[PDB]
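Q: What does the assembled structure look like for these inputs?
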Amino acid sequence: AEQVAAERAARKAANKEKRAIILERNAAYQKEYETAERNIIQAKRDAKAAGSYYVEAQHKLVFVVRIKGINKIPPKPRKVLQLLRLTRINSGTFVKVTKATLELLKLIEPYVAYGYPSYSTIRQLVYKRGFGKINKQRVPLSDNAIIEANLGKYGILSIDDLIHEIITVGPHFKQANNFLWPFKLSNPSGGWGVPRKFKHFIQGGSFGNREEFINKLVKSMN
Amino acid sequence: WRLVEVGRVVLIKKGQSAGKLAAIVEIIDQKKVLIDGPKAGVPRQAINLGQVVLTPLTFALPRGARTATVSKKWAAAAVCEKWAASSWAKKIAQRERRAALTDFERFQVMVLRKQKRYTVKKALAK
Amino acid sequence: HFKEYQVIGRRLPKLFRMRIFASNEVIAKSRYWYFLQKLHKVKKASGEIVSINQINEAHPTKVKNFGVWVRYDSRSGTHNMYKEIRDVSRVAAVETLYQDMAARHRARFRSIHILKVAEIEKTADVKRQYVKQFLTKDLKFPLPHRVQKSTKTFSYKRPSTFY
Amino acid sequence: LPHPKIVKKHTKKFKRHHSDRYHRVAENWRKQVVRRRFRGNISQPKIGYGSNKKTKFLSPSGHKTFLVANVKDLETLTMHTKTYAAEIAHNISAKNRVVILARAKALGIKVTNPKGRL
Amino acid sequence: LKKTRKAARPQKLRASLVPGTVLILLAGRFRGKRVVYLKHLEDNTLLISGPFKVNGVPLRRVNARYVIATSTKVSVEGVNVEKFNVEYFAKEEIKAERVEDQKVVDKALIAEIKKTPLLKQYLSASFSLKNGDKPHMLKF
Amino acid sequence: AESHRLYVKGKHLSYQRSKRVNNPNVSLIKIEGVATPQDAQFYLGKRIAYVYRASKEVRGSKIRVMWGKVTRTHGNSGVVRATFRNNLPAKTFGASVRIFLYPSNI
RNA sequence: GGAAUACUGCCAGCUGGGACUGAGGACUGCGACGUAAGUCAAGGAUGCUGGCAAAUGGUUAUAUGCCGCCGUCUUGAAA
RNA sequence: AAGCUCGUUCAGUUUUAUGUAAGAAUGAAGCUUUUAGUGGGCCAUUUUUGGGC
RNA sequence: GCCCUGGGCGCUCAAGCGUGUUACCUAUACUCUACCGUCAGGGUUGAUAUGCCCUGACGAGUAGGCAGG
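A:
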């Protein structure tokens, strides 16, 4: 029959059109990121030159990783971790920054480490350990069609779209975070560094808010 | 008896500047001193005595001399020529060359050693 | 390896300013917040850190007899202490003071407060003999009983400690 | 050929705990420190030792052993000669063993235990 | 069997192996002998010559991973090695061609070897280790 | 030449282990002259051969040899981990070993 | 006045050394190369070569490196 | 375990209301009915009791 | 700050003490992969079946309960 070639040609044309759409979207996202970083740097330069202090915006995205085992965990932190999908050790997920969540991290802070990720780390995680949740099953993200089918209605049709939504904390942050399976992370390649892991980071420990150092820690744990 | 003093030339034992020559410009304390070596390219920085070995050579240097003054005094003193004539520098160069010898170069060295040994043995007793 | 940072705050004004020495900006912010409670009554949620910037030595190529005023919380209260240290930079001078305190008084980063650091450009101003001895004219002294790290397990020459 | 490495997982056959010390205790495995799987003690058989489906029951020669005691049983393997090998029961007399071996050779079926009582 | 997607990409030789380079064999009857590289064969072996007239090592196929490279090089442009091929070593006692071809090959290389002083005797001497040797430090 | 050696000599210390647990699947081999892991990096992937003599004449000779390989460095003293298709007997603790120069890359 | 350099972070930059893994089983799927045929590192290893009539390996004894009497009992897991 | 039927309803999870209409965040149901067993003390902790316990 | 009165060998510019900086040792912990099983989802017959399969997760445990040999 003539279907064998006709269907192949039609699907190839549709895939080519979708590829061009994704390419233009990715180019726009990259241009937006570059412009935002350049504008931030220019604003800092202007503040420094004008003899006035800078008013950096609050960190709207944080990442939390489980650092302690299940044993002897008090019930409240254990429930917090369970509701945060931080069940097994060395696992983490992105969470929106709010007082409702900051006060939650305050309780699990002794048993978790968190900070402010970056575009490079988020992209690396999504590309390597990025696993999607479909029909309650764990499906690795390897094709743009897989993500598009589950989040097409939300305007997400590629891995780059998912990364852009996650980093920008856009309107569909809830759905993007839920679709992503909790990240399975190995122990750091270079080790935790400090001789005693179970201590506050600000006093030579590990657990606690470390801001940019979380990006370095994740890459070693990736 | 080698003594630490301003203008004393030293050899760095470990670090990116290991194997290069520097001079003590100003002593900081019992264990740390300030050294420089513009000719060798080592940046002006402080170093501990444990990481540096004092050479027997010495030259006059103004206290707290800057990089330009240190370089000018080093060039004027020509301490580099004295260092090369020292047996220590000769041994260092010999070790470097010997480690850099190729297999064919080593075979030629063995042949020359046998040739020299023949004559040396013939020279004995006589 | 410490680092010098300038941290200011105003509880969202007077713009309280002080110098904080820490290995990273995160520790510097925590130390600034802790010192805020001692200086006055302020909380972290009250405002925000207006600006934090690392301060580099103007010229890390000159030996300076740093005069440092340090207050530490000993096992029986806190006492004001003053010391002079000969070094090339403030970052190294404060680290040396911290190490000396930990070696003797066993005071560490947790219970040490840095008040002021200032250079001394005139002789006879340093009242500490251990620094005063190094302020004389170009001197010379030996390094007896020097040793060498013998990588080889065995030695055949009976090494000597001469320098 | 389709005879990949067959990993036995645990070649050593399990033995009943303390059976060596006491004669009356048989070597047949039976459940009860062993129950607590203490360090340095015999391992307990469990679901971890399950053999792969694609290689279960396969002999090292890569063929299943099928017991045969009549001409019809041997002929039944004519379709499955590629996978099933013949095996003569110990109760078969030598008189029928010759016929069974001849039929197996003529139909290409390998005999796992030839030369029996011959 | 599924259509395995594994193309037979041509072998890539390390930059330390160049025609006319002096090779050292670590395995085989000629282990420790010095040999001269000539041509790379389609079978991923290295065509080498002693030469036979100098150290007795004939033309043989060898594996690169068992050969230590050396900086010493000699001219090998005048030797027509195109005649030799993988089929030249098949067997399915010395063959007559094995002598004449070896002599012809060595005739176009003995002069080059003699051009460099002490190179003939250097090749005639088998390489061997000695007490205190540190191959990792040595450049070979 | 009097010396025909073509392999770097060494010694066998003990298998990879803990305070009370030892895994014979990995053997710690010490190479003479090596001092730091950086130097030992060159010996990675080199075949390790152990030679011992037996009264009985085996199929090929009176000599029996085990064919192993190098895996990775170990410790700060330059020790390198060695793995063999058949683990060496524990009686050879402290015995010498042969480390060949192939496969090579220099 | 000028660069340089330490440090931080990025490279959908390059180039190697070493360790384990070969799991699926005629093509259907997403991609790159190409003007087209076709090729590809693209939903899981292929190509070549050498040694072999005891080959590889199994049970067992003995010696080496490390580890280590039973069921019921009070019930605080216990002697 | 045993029927229904709602796919959503729930939480040892976290702040403003004055304990909540929460179109605040995060994670991801209910009534039944009969059916085996279940009557311990203790390590640390909490409330922080007095003169050893 | 430390001393005096108040695991074995040994260690004394420690191989003792406090602290700072790198590397290394390895749990059944963690990360990648091979296999058994349970649990969950799905393809299946104009015949390919209490079967042939694809995908994911999970694997401690006395009494007790259920299932399969």
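Strands of chain B lie at 8-12, 21-27, 32-37, 42-48, 52-58.
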